[model samples]
Target: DTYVTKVTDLTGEEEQVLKLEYDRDGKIIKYGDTPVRYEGDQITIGQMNKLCNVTFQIGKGKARESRARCMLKVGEEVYEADKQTVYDYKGDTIFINSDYRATSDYRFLKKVQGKYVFDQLGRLKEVMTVFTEANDSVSSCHTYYNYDNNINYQANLNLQAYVIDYDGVDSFFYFLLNLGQLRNRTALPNDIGYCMNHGLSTYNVHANYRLDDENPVRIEVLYNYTKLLSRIDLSYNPL
Candidate 1:
């Protein structure tokens, strides 16, 4: 049998905001509007740590370091760089350090390649990715999302931006979305000399490409909501 629980006035502000549902075995099945799904039985914290290729033993300072070094293991599914390195439980590359191990909700935080990635209500706010080149130098890609009245004071909307830098050249892109629907994307030109602005609406999209104010191409694409292309218009302006 399943049991449901609700609590009103949870914060003493006279608001009904707390609710939960549980199964017969006393495991939470649902909380608020989101459902909780689990596989197998719940494991202890120590077990979870072990599965994630991490070990925590409380002991003397130097003794703990020796123990950690001994416990570190590298296999087909596990990799640890140092005492602080951690991997996800399922063995997939969800969290990684700068050494490359192998491969959200509101108030959720994750670290990748020494950068902090934040998410709110399962929406990605900021993320970073690092790639190593043949010469041992590294390049980085960073993305950020904003949903507030900061950029545009008149309207509170969602804006996303990303920057990719490699070999001393940087490419920047920005997007304006309406309810997660892409409205426009602008690629700002950098030293490489390329820029594009793409606009999308219900069933139509327009892409304008420019090469440092020299050659400009404008394309209008009409498509069905099912993604079937219907018509296309292209115009080129060369200076």
Candidate 2:
């Protein structure tokens, strides 16, 4: 069984976009070749333009992340950065809650309960992010995944993409929309891109693949309903 070694952003050029390192028990410990630090109760990833500061809930005498707070870069001015949000985790789902609020652009926002829920196959089925506490119409979010029904190599390897944290879905892009630097070894996408729907937006992506006998060898990513976004090329280590 093989796991992905290289996931590149083939957008524009053959860019070596991402690489993640995981410890034996499927714990993500590295990002882009750098070791993630655990200190002052937080491990931070990415940068000012876009970053996630994760905190944990330690039980069983070790560490496990329970909350991941993220921010993004937009118009050189941050949007939706401070609406007071946090997260929680179980094997099947991640819960997000925040204070009721809005963006500078006057966008409807917050004090809501959200769930990024998955299923028996351990793949994401849909999102339940809209809740009305004070007002506004409440509706669920939609994310359509393209499944190949083929082997999910990442799952076989127990290298489920933890970085795929649905916690920060609104901003992050592969399943952290594919930065995939972290691993909980859970819910590995069965195969392909996604048609994600939320708020007032819709996005669909497709995948191109080549398999080494049921194991994926190459996965070319297509986004925004058919624009080439990137590629994931992988190889196996002999058992």
Candidate 3:
């Protein structure tokens, strides 16, 4: 059987589109009419993207022993993953206490200012932020994922915010929304946001906020194929 693949940006535009013909045993015979260059067990999407731009390293998987190590590099920023844990290119741990699920392939639980629960395949599932008894409050953000049902994969973030006094509170809250290498943070009241990865190109974000006794607010953000913010929709809803 022959296999072919196409990659596109968030705007539904083709970026690095290629067709590969493979033998029954999954050996690549042709890559867009050209002979295969790298001979391996499998051709990774990261390797294909590297063929176009030597600087890009997104979907490539590097393995050592039974552990899988991968690095995603965009410009000067790099995100590295060592099986269940994710780290910065500088070797600083980005997420703490990575607990792998026994029955899952790549799902893990980690703390990043808040308790983050990720589903199988390394996607954020939920986030819970708790405060001390001085403030007597807890907040949570739940994420729902859809695959191929509507444009490959999409995520929805629903946030519930509660009151927390920063004064004398031991709890530290830092929330960041990322679309590929691009990142954003909440500016006021309390920080809360959600991000989605749309296949190889697009990443969409929705930021929600809730202040003390104030109605909730939502912000829509969009990123392009280059992993940069291209547009933002600023709208407020009283809830």
Candidate 4:
């Protein structure tokens, strides 16, 4: 099986990289440690630490439930945290309904409350998020896609909930429809679910992946199909 193993951000002052370690089934297990670099008086390192972990387990029978927990911290402070999510698939939509809490006393946390609509052809038409924070401030927003109307090899790198190959066709195919799989995919606009972490909702970012292969050498994020917000590079390995 083929799975993503690395991510490189090209739209930043300091290039940041994220390497993924997946199990035999292509489920991500650990984050690789990146070496620090000294270039032109700039200190750079990969966006993640070796201590970070991501694990998934199958759930139930019909609904196909899964669980993930990501913890990267030292002492009492937290650098990043993952949400406890359960994705449910119905007729033609996959809904993300998870509450991300901070037992560690983190305040800027929220939960997802909406459906990302896709079709039988396996193309996601629109994405939405109705997040509520600790203050009960509701941040509701969504994006309607204007696509090329074909099965492309792009990835919505920040999907919190995922469907499988039979359920999804476009964007990411055959990979359990697991959007980006990484909760902190800082690549796409609002980046699917990552922006909900900061408690802000930008418009809707469209998906544009290279058709060359499943690895997506470069994925561009667009805001309203005009401005280029971010361009992320990727590499994959076979398990």
Candidate 5:
């Protein structure tokens, strides 16, 4: 007798846009090849007037260009260089958190900067960060936890927490966000040119979880893992 078997594929890829490119003089050159199809927030003027699209927002004072082709302009001050925000070389999903705090993915800026709380399994459970550029400078913080069963583990994690202090005062605090699970794999998106940007001829899928003591809620998003999304290279970090 042969046992029946079923296999479900969870790996894949999606298309996205590039955010910036630089030259030797440290001048703003091209922003991105993707056209600025949609426009939002306030528009302003500068020395070199060019048309582009708003992609991601880093904070209230920062917005990233959809195409990684130009310079950063806040009022009249343009940033000198392109900051490598986030990248996954093996996975090939690059992203840049821009200065404009008016984009859809602006929250990522705060998310990446903080000390992310994680479960005993090394899963991200919560994120805590109060080191805004405007508020403080060079705040050194540490994490402590207590694990339930893993004695060798750091702490028997009663609750995922982060504490921040600026000038010897606790300025930031947070409870765990409770990520149920996160899984990533790769696959091909249907039709290369359908939504393809750059040579992002492929895609990756990241599934996130919101956990409860009893059950968990699952959330997912697709990304152009093969191409650099804002100027950040998409790849996995060894650490």
Candidate 6:
């Protein structure tokens, strides 16, 4: 006969004795031991060094040079993986780093940031270009396009504004999102720019329009670590 039983709150001290008492197929399980949190306390995520059991900082010092490397911890174990890179294609699709390799046993999820596009095969499609100020503020709008032969045509333009404050030698960021057309009502054939800064963070973006038109459009965005909108401005001649 098939038997199914459920138990909860089996403390760590009782694990060994409980297993021996029950048959190999029928063992006592604890609900508290299984961690299902991701964001806050009680978080559990698989990493390379953790293996089956969760241990803190399991593989932390395993690798040298930690600039682009990332480590994840679960329970009492730590996992390590190379920081993943992003790629943008023509159509706004996105893909993770080409060197990323993980199987079921050591699988990991990549973190996504900023604006990006992805394709059906989990590949990058496109990335909106942006620009930044000297202090690392972003102030560039984004423009979508349709290309024919060697010439690209403008489809739309999205502009935003960023503001900042200066205290002695320190700079603070305060930006506004200006949702409107490029150069008033003119069609954007190329270019975008953006900028931002906050405390110790900054960002900037810029994109040069590939098409040759009466008005050359450019797109750019910027941020200083903290992703604050410091500046965003779009300028193009109207036809």
lDDT (tens digit, per residue) of candidate 2 on 143-205: 555345543544333333322324343224223422222233334344332232343655555
Misplaced by over 4 Å in model 1 are 1-98, 101-112, 117-124, 133-137, 149-239
lDDT of 2 at 100: 29
Scored against the true structure, residue 233 in model 4 reaches a CA lDDT of 73
lDDT tens digits, residues 35-104, model 4? 3232332222233332222222333422233232334343365535444555566665767566555545
Q: lDDT per prediction?
A: 0.27, 0.46, 0.26, 0.46, 0.24, 0.26
Off by over 4 Å in 5: 1-78, 82-113, 134-239
Better of 4 and 6 by lDDT: 4
**What lDDT, from 0 to 1, does candidate 2 have?**
0.46
Candidate 3 RMSD computed on C-alpha atoms after optimal superposition onto the true structure: 18.1
> Highest lDDT: which candidate?
2
Instruction: Tell me the tens digit of each residue's lDDT in model 3 across 136-231.
Output: 332333333332221111111111111211111011111111212212111122222333222323223333232222322222232332333322
Q: Please provide TM-scores, in order, for all candidate models, with all chains considered together.
A: 0.22, 0.55, 0.23, 0.55, 0.20, 0.17
Candidate 1 steric clashes: 1
lDDT by residue (tens digit), candidate 6, 85-155 = 33222443322221211333545433323343434432222333333322344443332332222222332
Deviation in Å, model 1, residue 119 alpha carbon:
10
The better-scoring model by TM-score among 1 and 4 is 4
Runs in model 4 lying further than 4 Å from the true structure:
1-5, 20-55, 60-82, 104-109, 149-151, 154-208, 213-215, 223-226, 236-239
Sort by lDDT, top down from the best:
2, 4, 1, 3, 6, 5
Worst 10 residues of 3 by lDDT: 168-177
> What is the alpha-carbon lDDT for the whole of candidate 3?
0.26
Q: Can you tell me which runs of candidate 3 are displaced by over 4 Å?
A: 1-5, 8-15, 27-239
Against the correct fold, how does model 3 do in TM-score? 0.23
